[PDB]
Amino acid sequence: ADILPANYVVKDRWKVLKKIGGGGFGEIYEAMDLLTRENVALKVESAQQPKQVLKMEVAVLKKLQGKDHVCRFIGCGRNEKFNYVVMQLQGRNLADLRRSQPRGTFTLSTTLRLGKQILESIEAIHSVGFLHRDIKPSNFAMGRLPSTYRKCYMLDFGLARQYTNTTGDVRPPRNVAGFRGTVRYASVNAHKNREMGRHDDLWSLFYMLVEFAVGQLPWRKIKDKEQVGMIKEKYEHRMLLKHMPSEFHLFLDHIASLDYFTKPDYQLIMSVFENSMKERGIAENEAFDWEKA
Numbered sequence: 180a181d182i183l184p185a186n187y188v189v190k191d192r193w194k195v196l197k198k199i200g201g202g203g204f205g206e207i208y209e210a211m212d213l214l215t216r217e218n219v220a221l222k223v224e225s226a227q228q229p230k231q232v233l234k235m236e237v238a239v240l241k242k243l244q245g246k247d248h249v250c251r252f253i254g255c256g257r258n259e260k261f262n263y264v265v266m267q268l269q270g271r272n273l274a275d276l277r278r279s280q281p282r283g284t285f286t287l288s289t290t291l292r293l294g295k296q297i298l299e300s301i302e303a304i305h306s307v308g309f310l311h312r313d314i315k316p317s318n319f320a321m322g323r324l325p326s327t328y329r330k331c332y333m334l335d336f337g338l339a340r341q342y343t344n345t346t347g348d349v350r351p352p353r354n355v356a357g358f359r360g361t362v363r364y365a366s367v368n369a370h371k372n373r374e375m376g377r378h379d380d381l382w383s384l385f386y387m388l389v390e391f392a393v394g395q396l397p398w399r400k401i402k403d404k405e406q407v408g409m410i411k412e413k414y415e416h417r418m419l420l421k422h423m424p425s426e427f428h429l430f431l432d433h434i435a436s437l438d439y440f441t442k443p444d445y446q447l448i449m450s451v452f453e454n455s456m457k458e459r460g461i462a463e464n465e466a467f468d469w470e471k472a
């Protein structure tokens with residue numbers, strides 16, 4: 180039932196090596212580029228799938244070309260069996276890297292520097308008029324080259340939504356929008372099946388950085404969406420910051436002030452990370468936790 184078999188060649192150029200990811204809505208393969216001789220990510224969608232999502236993912240990827248923390252676009256195409264996108268292959272995701280740490284925690288140095296890169300990638304996708312809507316550690320992957328191995332990349336626009344109309348205006352929110360993303364990092368707004376905004380992506384970032392620094396979130400043992408939302412709705416969020424830099428209160432208060440319509444203050448959040456690093460003498464040039472150094 181895999182869409183492409185091993186050694187299958189796409190457009191006489193991209194040869195399937197193995198499947199590296201799968202879901203309801205498509206599959207991702209590591210392929211060899213028979214022209215350039217590097218390996219690539221080959222993402223495919225069945226031609227016969229009711230929800231045709233990959234054309235939107237490619238439109239977003241193309242709008243982001245030239246930004247940092249974005250996979251290079253290599254090509255795309257469509258035939259009678261599948262649609263496909265070829266993109267730059269990335270490496271280890273942050274969820275696997277965090278689980279590989281002794282106590283499931285990153286240092287504050289690693290946490291804050293990742294936070295700056297993730298924030299940049301979130302502002303970038305927002306700047307081209309899209310919400311990610313499933314910001315989570317497994318959707319960020321470190322690079323796999325000398326030129327990229329300390330760079331963090333945003334993956335999987337499969338749940339993204341355009342929040343502007345054709346002429347650049349904010350579009351009306353639906354009175355109910357079914358939240359179909361991952362439970363652990365979902366905002367209270369997403370839990371309430373409210374239309375998601377730019378602020379909800381920054382809620383996911385907030386929850387991610389607490390889990391990175393502390394090793395856990397209070398609801399991590401609860402998989403049920405409704406239960407987790409009821410736990411978050413009451414949870415005293417300042418408690419999440421007991422063992423975090425005090426600047427994080429400025430981040431919490433700012434995102435708690437936002438609504439669907441309000442452009443976030445990305446700079447205020449960036450300065451929380453930069454001030455937290457400067458207070459603690461954390462340098463940009465520092466080793467990440469997973470490096471020998």
Ligand SMILES: CC[C@](C)(O)C#Cc1ccc2[nH]c3c(c2c1)-c1nc(N)ncc1CCC3
Nearest residue numbers: 199200207220236267268269334335336337
């Ligand atoms: C960002 C643009 C797009 C087309 O929406 C996507 C994706 C995607 C969705 C699910 C995925 N799942 C995976 C990857 C991956 C990528 C992946 N991908 C790339 N480029 N290296 C490495 C990996 C890691 C292997 C798993």
